[PDB]
Scaffold this active site. Structure first.
Site, short mmCIF file in Angstrom:
data_model
loop_
_atom_site.label_atom_id
_atom_site.label_comp_id
_atom_site.label_asym_id
_atom_site.label_seq_id
_atom_site.Cartn_x
_atom_site.Cartn_y
_atom_site.Cartn_z
N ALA A 83 26.35 14.07 -15.80
CA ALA A 83 25.38 12.98 -15.83
C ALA A 83 24.76 12.86 -17.24
CB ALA A 83 24.28 13.21 -14.78
N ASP A 84 24.83 11.67 -17.80
CA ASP A 84 24.18 11.38 -19.08
C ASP A 84 22.76 10.88 -18.76
OD1 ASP A 84 24.34 8.48 -18.53
OD2 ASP A 84 26.44 8.67 -19.14
N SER A 85 21.99 10.53 -19.78
CA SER A 85 20.60 10.11 -19.60
C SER A 85 20.46 8.82 -18.78
CB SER A 85 19.91 9.95 -20.96
OG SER A 85 19.78 11.21 -21.58
#
Ligand code: NA
Ligand SMILES: [Zn+2]
Ligand SMILES: [Zn+2]
Ligand SMILES: [Zn+2]
Ligand SMILES: [Zn+2]
Ligand SMILES: [Zn+2]
Length: 80
Positions: free
Chosen positions: A37-39
């Site tokens: 998961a990225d930001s």
């Protein structure tokens, strides 16, 4: 009385938001470390928990929702 239905439904949101194989999702899954998961992924996932469960997750609590278990426990406490 047990966390099984809400665990199922939390994993549903995680699978819908991130698209990962359901088989990979367990209570110890860490969204950033395990599921890449990225930001952006993380903000959207938080918002999906809020909509899907009718709970509020302000940014100070959002940063602490690291795992599937964290999300489940937070939702359970919110509904208590
Ligand atoms: Na705030
Ligand atoms: Zn389901
Ligand atoms: Zn769905
Ligand atoms: Zn958004
Ligand atoms: Zn935790
Ligand atoms: Zn619980």
């Amino acid at each position: 009385s047990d966390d099984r239905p809400l665990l199922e439904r939390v994993k549903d949101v995680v699978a819908d938001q991130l698209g990962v194989d359901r088989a990979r999702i367990n209570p110890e899954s860490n969204f950033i470390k395990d599921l890449d998961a990225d930001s952006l992924d993380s903000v959207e996932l938080v918002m999906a928990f809020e909509e899907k469960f009718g709970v509020s997750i302000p940014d100070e609590e959002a940063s602490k929702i690291a795992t599937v278990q964290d999300a489940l426990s937070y939702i359970e406490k919110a509904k208590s």
